[PDB]
Amino acid sequence: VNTATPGELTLMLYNGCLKFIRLAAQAIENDDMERKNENLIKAQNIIQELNFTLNRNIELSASMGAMYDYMYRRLVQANIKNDTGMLAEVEGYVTDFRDAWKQAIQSE
Amino acid sequence: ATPGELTLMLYNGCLKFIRLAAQAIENDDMERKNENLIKAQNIIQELNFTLNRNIELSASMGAMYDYMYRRLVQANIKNDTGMLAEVEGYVTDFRDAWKQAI
Structure with a gap:
């Protein structure tokens, strides 16, 4: 976990x-x-x-990479402040990425 | 898969x-x-x-993935180990370059 x-x-x-x-x-x-x-x-x-x-x-493209940076940064900020609120926003972003990825899969 | x-x-x-x-x-x-x-x-x-x-x-690596895929399919049909070796060489290079990036 600390050595990924x-x-x-x-x-x-x-x-x-x-x-x-x-x-x-x-x-x-x-x-x-x-x-x-x-x-x-x-x-x-x-x-x-x-x-x-x-x-x-x-x-x-790169904008998705900027999206990851933000999420990573937020999870770190949610881990320091015990802010389930920030986990909720990040979960909202990731949920759409997955569904969107799931589509791109079936879509072939 | x-x-x-x-x-x-x-x-x-x-x-x-x-x-x-x-x-x-x-x-x-x-x-x-x-x-x-x-x-x-x-x-x-x-x-x-x-x-x-x-x-x-870039997308160029994409064309290389297609070719490799086709060479494997072809090597499977031809029972050709020379073709396998070819692909093996590419994958080894890509893996080293990636092992470096990391």
């Missing part, structure tokens, strides 16, 4: 993608078709996960 | 922790308030970092 490294999740997908590709190569060299297909399907899923997020993030 | 799930997951996680924090404050539970508020904060930085990088990589 911003950006590690994408890193994790990258590491996952590489393992699946490598496992896929081993599956082929050893006549294991089922394990080759499953791993490539998974390697493919990570790429599409990154692809989706990249594209949507480019559309949201 | 649904492309986009993981971010949806982060948003939902972030809402849970924000909500548990509101609960803690009312119960004068400073312990859990801090815990949950830091988690929600970590999620925001996680989303903020990714967004900032993705905008720097």
Whole structure:
């Protein structure tokens, strides 16, 4: 909780993608078709996960980044003043981001 | 699998922790308030970092993701490990560059 490294999740997908590709190569060299297909399907899923997020993030642009900064800043300010009020406003913003993101998902 | 799930997951996680924090404050539970508020904060930085990088990589990285996707599909059909190695090289480069950004 105090040691979170911003950006590690994408890193994790990258590491996952590489393992699946490598496992896929081993599956082929050893006549294991089922394990080759499953791993490539998974390697493919990570790429599409990154692809989706990249594209949507480019559309949201820097103003969305300014939005995050604010929220982060507010949660810190709500944590120092025990202001459930500020948690309510931040919750209102995040709720719309999620619903909006949920849409962008189904929308394909 | 649904492309986009993981971010949806982060948003939902972030809402849970924000909500548990509101609960803690009312119960004068400073312990859990801090815990949950830091988690929600970590999620925001996680989303903020990714967004900032993705905008720097630009849409060109997007075309590269499509190609890689197609090469994998092709490599699966051809049982070609040379193609896998190719993609593996790109992903390793992108992962290192990201490991640096962090």
